[PDB]
Design a binder for this molecule. Structure first.
Ligand SMILES: CCCCCCCCCCCCCCCCCCCC(=O)OC(CO)CO
Ligand SMILES: CCCCCCCCCCCCCCCCCCCC(=O)OC(CO)CO
Ligand SMILES: [Cl-]
Ligand SMILES: [Cl-]
Lengths: 136, 136
């Protein structure tokens, strides 16, 4: 019943979002791009080649890809344009993506619950939950 | 008539190879994996989201992906398992991928000639040319 990293592999579509505006505010995202991101309703394509993890976020506005090895720190350029130092780990059934930039930090965790991918984003007191389902 | 980075985008299949064994020897690849790599005849899928470049090498034996921003150094784990510091640049119609590890260096350049992707690999006195064509 506990997920593995491979369970996250696939093409996922955003079905539900809560607290995303508030989270993007904490990250520093301005109004215009916030509204653009809120209307964007993307896919998230995840591939897991062993512990080589690739996460592709695809929308009609912008597409982002990072590809990493689990537990090895890497430089990420985020969709909002932050340059972070990021490490992905796998903890209690969740992919945990920790970003640090300018002495700030945020965590994005992705986990399978009840066949859906639950993506929880935290920065300071701001939390966002996004629900994805698998494209058939 | 001179190529741009976007011309490299697509799904490419290996059609011709010369000097690949000799190049893999210079890299340190042992006999077994050399023969495995020589029979592998992969695809190379390249995406170019502005200057965010993703190169996915796909085979039935192993699949590798790196995703980088042009001109920003990054840590690559190569298909043969080297941990390098790599920088991709765009020079005279070619994507140039420079790898350094342990005071060693190698360059892989990818360019469109006559509608095919020519991939030239150099390390020391060892050179390899691989020819890819676009999958329809
Ligand atoms: C949502 C962004 C799409 C592109 C928006 C258009 C322009 C750029 C503005 C981006 C707004 C800031 C995004 C940074 C937050 C990333 C985490 C999002 C979590 C998520 O569902 O994504 C997925 C994969 O990241 C988790 O599975
Ligand atoms: C060829 C390797 C496929 C996997 C082989 C199976 C197991 C791992 C052994 C790999 C042998 C060493 C490969 C390192 C050399 C990479 C450059 C290859 C150039 C090429 O055509 O690739 C493409 C994309 O890299 C250029 O477009
Ligand atoms: Cl990036
Ligand atoms: Cl890598």
């Amino acid at each position: 019943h506990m997920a593995s990293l491979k369970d996250l592999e696939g093409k996922w579509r955003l079905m539900e979002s809560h607290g995303f505006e508030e989270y993007m505010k904490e990250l520093g995202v301005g109004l215009a791009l916030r509204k653009m991101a809120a209307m964007a309703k993307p896919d998230c394509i995840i591939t897991c080649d062993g512990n080589n993890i690739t996460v592709k976020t695809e929308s009609t506005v912008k597409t982002t890809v990072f590809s990493c090895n689990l537990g090895e720190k890497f430089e990420e350029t985020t969709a909002d344009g932050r340059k972070t130092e990021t490490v992905c780990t796998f903890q209690d059934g969740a992919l945990v993506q920790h970003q640090q930039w300018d002495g700030k930090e945020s965590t994005i965790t992705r986990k399978l619950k009840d066949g859906k991918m639950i993506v929880e984003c935290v920065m300071n007191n701001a939390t966002c939950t996004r629900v994805y389902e698998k494209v058939q």
